[PDB]
Every structure is written in C-alpha cells, then in structure tokens.
C-alpha cells in the first residue's frame, strides 16, 4: 500500500505509464522524456513487464534480503 500505484507501480515503467505513478510533475513531455533518459535510474522510461521479462537480467544477479513489505526508515 505504501509502494507505487498499481497498474505502474506494479507492473511495469513507461515514460507515458509511469507518469501513472508520478502523474504531473514536468511541463511538456519533451523536457521529460529528455530529462530522465540521462537523470533516470534506467533511462529507459517505456518499457513493459513483457519487455522486461525478455531483456535484462536484475534477480539473475542480485539477492534481496527476507523483507516483509516496505520498510522505509
């Protein structure tokens, strides 16, 4: 409940659907779509859970810890 929204909070990230969870934020989609290619922590911004199951490979290398929820402290 504490994390992101839903459809985009819990799915997948796009430029147009991860406004979704961060919804008014920018001026014109130009500056953001610019903005975060270079300062977002993907740069990718677009792309779905379909795509994101083909290409990259985070949990292949990466262990999380045994958390419960959020935990934000």
Known sequence: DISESLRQGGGKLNFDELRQDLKG??????????????????????????????????????REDLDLDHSSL
């Open 25 to 62: 934020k920018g001026h014109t989609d130009a500056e953001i779509e610019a903005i975060f290619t270079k300062y977002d922590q993907d740069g990718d911004q677009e792309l779905t859970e379909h795509e994101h199951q083909q290409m990259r490979d985070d949990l292949e290398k990466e």
